[PDB]
Design a protein around this nucleic acid. Structure first.
Lengths: 93, 87, 214, 36, 249, 55, 73, 97
RNA sequence: AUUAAACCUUGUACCUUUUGCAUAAUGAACUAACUAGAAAACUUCUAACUAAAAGAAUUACAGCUAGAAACCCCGAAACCAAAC
């Protein structure tokens, strides 16, 4: 193969920016907050996996139940077909 | 386009190696090139030979008529080695 | 009048108290105004840095969510490529997490990176004064300031700390191992030390929680 | 990203070969080992 | 502690210095190269408390000796682990620890051993058995949650006809037993061991030890059908006559 | 967990006795567990190796 | 994306906006109200609680209506 | 920089809007209303008198108690009948053997 | 090896497959990119705590909690539904 004849543009990274500098703050909310709020409550992301983790099949199944009423017909049918293939592999092989 | 800076840097070294082979640099004396100390080399030169040299006399022996002209020419813009040479 | 502090809880008889120099930020040369006592079971724990190592990994990887995805042959109009959003969240034992914070406190104190202060109040809000005082007291390039509660923190400190990238101010409840490791030196108020000790020392006993404390 | 250097490693030992062997990595590698 | 001396000398640690503990992570295999290239419910689930296990709780003061032994206090003291999902229905004792448990105190246990009853009575303790419904007992162990729900105190249930003979039996010392036989029964137990029977009435705290709640009454402190002002940390008593009829029903 | 109550006579009838006083001046100090018990645990590994551990 | 309101709520949103809102309240009430038809082919449970013979415990009861098809005729 | 204010859960009673479609049904049940009273008691504002069963509810409870839960007198009679049957069984076994 | 590119001397192309053998047999004009091992129920190991352990639902007469550790690709003749 042939490779670039020029260097990529230089990248400058600030390691003391607000995001990196303050990353993780309040991760001890439970111990330092009397455990009123569990650290799992601080997870931000898809609703079906906030405070929960599982394999892809479990994640997909949980996603379907959580937003199945809000899922598109095309998406719901496609998800069902994919789940069918996944179900046979995991539960029969 | 292949991503990454290490790979691009590596190719630059490859280009330099080809360039050096194609166009060798013109020769230059080590004196002009960096990391040269005449006094240290003379001391090392004498020690390596296991011989005692008079630093002032040895410098005069190394000094040449042509060298003086360049300094004088630069000066316009010191003892020769002839006496030692004859001996 | 030296400011003398003693541990509220009963220190073990076989363990002597730990002590440190109390400082104030009111003046450049107000380095020492009193001497305080620190509970050995908190500030003299064993140096188990692997727990600190584990806590750092847990802190970074419990929030990690990867959104990388690739389409398989059945989905094409990668055989083993990323498939949808993936989560890496996991929970370390509560006791271990408390111990990890305790270990970090000992490391800073034993390494002369922890500075106990009576209060964070500053004569002026100019960031220049804070940085210069850190230079005078040979503090690290990054200094972390901790107060008991966010609401009552002095106005003067907020302006200076907010405008300083390497000097960050956090509340007591926001203290974590990652910030302490990231910051060269730690500045702790006297009330914060008492606040931290209570929760850490409260961990004694189990009386397992039959239900979440929320 | 270093596959070129891997080919060069075989090539340096196969430069003196003759024919398509000296320029084909499939053939050059075999000859280099046999020579060693 | 020479280890501390090492810590003070060492320079400040950094984030990059962090290293996983030895043997913490095992190796993993990936196909990048040739290496992986190519190829009973009806029967009560009685949970026992040993006499030796009983003795240490008193010794450690985990349960107040002055207060009569109560199952809830044991739950508060974490003496035993009860799971409603396990659907534990009964409480009993372990025959072990008879000769290492020298103590006298009032106690109530769903099930008590006949031999154990005399031994504690020989020491001077008072022992009886009361029936708590498995659903009621689960509520009893966790009083705060049903207050949050808003449920009021219900009347304590009674055993099924299968277990009625046990509770009604005088020797079993159940609350369904005839009180008239207890004086005669207590003497008989004393003769069986032969120890001189110590009259409970002689005890200064006799009324406290001998106090017993009504069969309908779940809590000695709180009568059945009562309500609690959890917000005000007070107890609320219904004042409706129809509610009394409801409780009577 | 509350601290153990003072008893008139030690050892306790069950057998519990608080740490002896004065404590030994040996270089190594063994602290009691949070339950005020001796930190010795019998452990078996591989189903055949009996072990005891002091922590 | 995903629909914030499920599809079944689409009908409710339509009824709450446009000409549907302007419809007479009396007629709107008649459409909105739904009344269970009198049972004919199935018997509803008289009591709401029964004692299961196997466990001898009182349990809440539910009614299963028999499926009946009513043709347009 | 200064850290943002710590996250805090809102305390005190909160009443879901019944009309809102999104709100789940179970959050609008009387059990939820009873839950509000339990959390805050008088601060919730739920009248304590409502917590007790209604007269129509009371009648249903009374029927269930009589129908399924026997009294002590009924239990005692059943024991006597069982004892009599057992006594007859013992006599039958003795005469047969 | 050599003063010397060739001469003299030595040496039965490669992968796969057959027997651990090919003078069998398959596949390859060459260049560049793309192209095939994926899951934790239990165990060992690393640690927290200990008759207890786990931030609710689990197990327990040393157990219990956390972490790490795993199982490919391409290719039929077919079969069925709905259109054309």
């Amino acid at each position: 193969a042939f490779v670039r004849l020029t260097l990529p543009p230089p990248k400058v990274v600030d390691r003391w920016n607000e995001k990196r500098a303050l990353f993780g703050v309040y991760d001890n909310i439970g111990i330092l907050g009397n455990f009123e709020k569990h650290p799992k409550e601080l997870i931000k992301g898809p609703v079906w996996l906030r405070g929960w983790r599982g394999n892809e099949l479990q994640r997909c199944v949980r996603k379907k139940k959580f937003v199945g009423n809000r899922m598109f017909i095309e998406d719901l049918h496609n998800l069902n077909k994919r789940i069918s293939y996944l179900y046979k592999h995991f539960n029969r092989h | 386009v292949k991503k990454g800076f290490r790979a691009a840097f590596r190719f630059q070294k490859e280009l330099e190696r080809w360039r050096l082979l194609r166009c060798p640099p013109p020769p230059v004396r080590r004196s002009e090139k960096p990391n040269w100390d005449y006094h240290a080399e003379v001391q090392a030169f004498g020690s390596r030979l296991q011989e005692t040299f008079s630093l002032d006399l040895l410098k005069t022996a190394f000094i040449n008529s042509c060298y003086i002209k360049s300094e004088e020419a630069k000066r316009q813009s010191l003892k020769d080695n002839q006496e030692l040479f004859e001996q | 009048d030296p400011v003398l502090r003693k541990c509220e809880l009963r220190i073990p008889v076989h363990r002597r108290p730990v002590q440190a120099w109390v400082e104030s930020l009111r003046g450049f040369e107000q380095e020492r105004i009193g001497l305080a006592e620190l509970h050995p079971d908190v500030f003299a724990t064993a140096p188990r840095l692997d727990i600190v190592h584990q806590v750092a990994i847990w802190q970074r990887n419990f929030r990690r969510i990867s959104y990388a995805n690739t389409k398989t042959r059945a989905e094409v109009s990668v055989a083993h490529g990323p498939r949808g959003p993936t989560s890496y969240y996991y929970m370390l034992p509560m006791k271990v997490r408390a111990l990890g914070l305790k270990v970090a406190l000992t490391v800073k104190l034993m390494q002369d990176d922890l500075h106990i202060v009576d209060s964070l109040e500053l004569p002026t809000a100019d960031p220049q004064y804070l940085t210069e005082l850190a230079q005078y007291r040979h503090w690290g390039s990054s200094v972390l300031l901790v107060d008991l509660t966010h609401e009552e923190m002095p106005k003067n400190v907020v302006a200076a700390t907010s405008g300083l990238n390497s000097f960050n101010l956090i509340p007591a409840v926001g203290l974590n191992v990652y910030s302490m490791l990231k910051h060269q030196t730690l500045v702790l108020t006297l009330p914060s030390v008492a606040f931290l000790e209570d929760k850490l020392l409260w961990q004694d006993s189990r009386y397992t929680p039959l239900y979440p404390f929320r | 990203t270093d596959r070129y250097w891997r080919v060069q490693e075989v090539l340096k030992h196969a430069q003196h070969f003759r024919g398509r062997k000296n320029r084909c990595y499939r053939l050059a590698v075999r000859a280099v080992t046999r020579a060693f | 502690g020479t280890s501390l001396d090492l810590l003070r000398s060492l320079p400040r640690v950094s984030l990059a210095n962090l290293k996983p503990s030895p043997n913490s992570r095992k190796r993993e295999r990936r196909p990048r190269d040739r290496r992986r290239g190519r190829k009973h419910s009806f029967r009560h689930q009685y949970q026992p408390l040993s006499l030796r296990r009983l003795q240490y709780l008193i010794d450690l003061g985990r349960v107040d000796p002055t207060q009569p032994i109560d199952l809830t206090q044991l739950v508060n003291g974490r003496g035993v682990t009860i799971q409603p999902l396990k659907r534990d229905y009964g409480v009993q004792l372990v025959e072990e620890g008879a000769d290492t448990f020298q103590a006298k105190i009032n106690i109530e246990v769903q099930l008590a051993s006949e031999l154990a009853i005399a031994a504690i009575e020989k020491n001077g303790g008072v022992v009886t058995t009361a029936f708590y419904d498995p659903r009621s007992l689960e509520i009893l162990c966790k009083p705060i949650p049903f207050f949050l729900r808003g449920q009021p105190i219900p009347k304590r249930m009674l055993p099924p006809e299968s277990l009625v003979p046990y509770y009604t039996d005088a020797k079993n010392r159940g609350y369904l037993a005839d009180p008239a036989k207890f004086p005669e029964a207590r003497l008989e137990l004393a003769m069986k061991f032969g120890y001189v029977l110590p009259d409970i009435t002689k005890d200064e705290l006799f009324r406290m030890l001998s106090a017993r709640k009504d069969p309908r009454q779940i809590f000695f402190g709180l009568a059945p059908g009562w309500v609690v002002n959890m917000a005000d940390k007070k107890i609320l008593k219904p004042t409706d006559e129809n509610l009394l009829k409801y409780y009577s029903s | 967990i509350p601290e153990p109550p003072k008893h008139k006579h030690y050892p306790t009838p069950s057998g519990w006795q608080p740490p002896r006083d004065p404590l030994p001046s040996l270089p190594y100090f063994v602290r009691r567990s949070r339950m005020h018990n001796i930190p010795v645990y019998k452990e078996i590994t591989h189903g055949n190796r009996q072990m005891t551990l002091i922590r | 994306p995903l629909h914030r309101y499920p599809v079944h709520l689409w009908q409710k949103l339509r009824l709450r906006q446009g000409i549907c809102a302007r419809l007479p309240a009396h007629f709107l009430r008649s459409l909105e109200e739904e009344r269970t038809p009198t049972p004919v082919h199935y018997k509803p449970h008289g009591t709401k609680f029964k004692i299961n013979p196997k466990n001898g415990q009182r349990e809440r009861v539910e009614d299963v209506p028999i499926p009946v098809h009513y043709p347009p005729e | 920089y200064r850290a943002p204010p710590p996250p805090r859960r809102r305390p005190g009673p909160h009443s879901p809007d019944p009309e809102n479609l999104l709100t789940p049904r179970w959050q609008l049940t009387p059990r939820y209303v009873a839950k509000q009273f339990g959390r805050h008691g008088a601060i919730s504002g739920v009248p304590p008198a409502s917590l007790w069963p209604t007269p129509e509810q009371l009648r249903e409870l009374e029927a269930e108690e009589q129908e399924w839960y026997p009294s002590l007198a009924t239990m005692q009679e059943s024991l006597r009948l069982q004892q009599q049957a057992l006594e007859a069984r013992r006599q039958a076994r003795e005469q047969r053997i």
